[PDB]
Amino acid sequence: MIKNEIKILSDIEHIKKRSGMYIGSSANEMHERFLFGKWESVQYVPGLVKLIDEIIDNSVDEGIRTKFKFANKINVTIKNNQVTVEDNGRGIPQAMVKTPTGEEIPGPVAAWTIPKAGGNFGDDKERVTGGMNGVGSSLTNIFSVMFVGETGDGQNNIVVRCSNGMENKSWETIPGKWKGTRVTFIPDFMSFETNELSQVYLDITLDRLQTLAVVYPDIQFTFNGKKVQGNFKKYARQYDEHAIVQEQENCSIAVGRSPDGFRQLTYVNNIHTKNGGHHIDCVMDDICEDLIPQIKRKFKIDVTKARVKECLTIVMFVRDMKNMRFDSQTKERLTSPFGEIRSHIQLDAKKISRAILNNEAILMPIIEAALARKL
């Protein structure tokens, strides 16, 4: 007898109880990843990072929605454990919405306090925003001791003041000409194996904002008062001095050395696919299938597709993909159809193949054991 008693859970309850299917690990652990081009190994709690990224994602969504005519200044601030994200998008439409449970609640209130409530539930094939599930804001709110969202459309502002894991919710409206979005929160450090939003979280969010600045040059980000600049070839050279780049229509990619296994920083629209997934798998495949031809052809050697890739760092931004799909709320693994991906990425792997064959620093580790095993 382990009891098998059936119980039913509210959305908020379920978010609290199965938090890691919603935001990730609470534990303060050591992960390997990229910071400023360096494959370091650093200690953070992944869920805390997500709490920030949700609010950022939302602003960058609005920039996307309006082709950067709106939300082209995004101001991020991290000061004594308080995260502030301000943008100049159009604000959250203040119109009201009806929940099936009778109630009648202002637009932004539901956006921020009701899971399964957002503005990315349209025709999937046309959805270009990184946002889609309608939950990430409520996640930051549910895991915040204080959460305060301010939007205004140019007419009036609504403030939604939330405390203690969104069990205190209140909202007021006052007229105003301001038009944009501000969100401020303090994480609930009881759901996390830290008690401080210490310096590493500052490093990550800057690093994220640097990467967002190169995907999205029409947005001027600022972190803690300092504007974030961006030049893609400059960015890429942070990962390997001896890197090489190619930029297409819906694509910017860079290839460089790795000392210790395939590494990849890889973006799909405004989303960091830290676990890779289909897009990077497919382009590494199309890459390797011109390379191993030429390499076995230029040198008569056999090297494996794992050998090629266990020596590359890759950086790839895919812009403007419709209806992108993932296997988790954490959007860490692009899971869209291989065919539709390959339709968007117009990858000239031929190009990319010849330039990697003409870059000794990059080419040599691939074929090295193979050449030394030939004699």
Place this chain on the structure above:
Amino acid sequence: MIKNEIKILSDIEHIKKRSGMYIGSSANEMHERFLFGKWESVQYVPGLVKLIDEIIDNSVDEGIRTKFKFANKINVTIKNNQVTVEDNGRGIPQAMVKTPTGEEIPGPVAAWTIPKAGGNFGDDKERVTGGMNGVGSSLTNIFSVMFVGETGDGQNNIVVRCSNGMENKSWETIPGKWKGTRVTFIPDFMSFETNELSQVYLDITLDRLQTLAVVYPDIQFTFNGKKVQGNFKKYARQYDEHAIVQEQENCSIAVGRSPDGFRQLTYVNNIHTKNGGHHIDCVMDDICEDLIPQIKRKFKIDVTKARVKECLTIVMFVRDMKNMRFDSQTKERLTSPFGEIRSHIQLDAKKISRAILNNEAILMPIIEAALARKL
């Protein structure tokens, strides 16, 4: 202007609309993975596979709950697109449950038709069942054109007859001495890029049941009338004739060659962590940190931790872990704290290190390029 209109979605709606955060890809695609020890590359739609695995997981959960005194025969059948899973656990307690939306609904009805309803919402630190979220059954039901669950506790049976994505639900009860669980369903092939539960799905589910038979020798599985047998050393040798095994308290692990990058089949209780995650990362680390000592010590060579692992296949079952945690409903990535993992796996990496140094077939590819680069 892309419109930013806020909308609210029911649980079922959200499952339908964001299905891939719940079950995975609908697309009929080519994935690399293990079947019967062979790293083949085969074509399936991952979500369809999940629809089966949910119902299986549930029976194996009950076997776990009752230390295999119940649910030690589990009968799986796949015939003309109809999946049947029968077990002899205690049945789903027929008592009633109250939803916050007023209603009063029999235990098994909610289990199978209400998301966020199950019997794995107890004290997390004591939860040993692979089940935890209370949604997988409703997922099979939501993505089934016909779903029919039968349980009885020894007193009576309830039948819950569901059709067309769980928009037709009905249930009846009749007394009976039968005590166990039967679930039968036909997938809704409109949410998937196939129209047939063709032979590959048979191959996968047998392969899964073979793997479950070696983790759980106290359960006699049968697939389509044929009982599934199990001997761990026999299983392991399917992945590499020249494999090697070690079996501890909460651990069975096997190590063998790989021709093309780190491969791993890896189980945590009754769950296939196809994406690996923490447990395999941590034990590969503890493995490599005695190996690279001895290897640089037995041969004065430097090989990388990616080099070691890019040559291993690993098979690892971790049994009996409390409160295991993942980053998605698909339970594909064990995400529990590195410390708690290492507490459960009492890994004698020392042992495992010396035996891999004493197995030429396994040792030689690691150090090979390194030795040939030494002269």
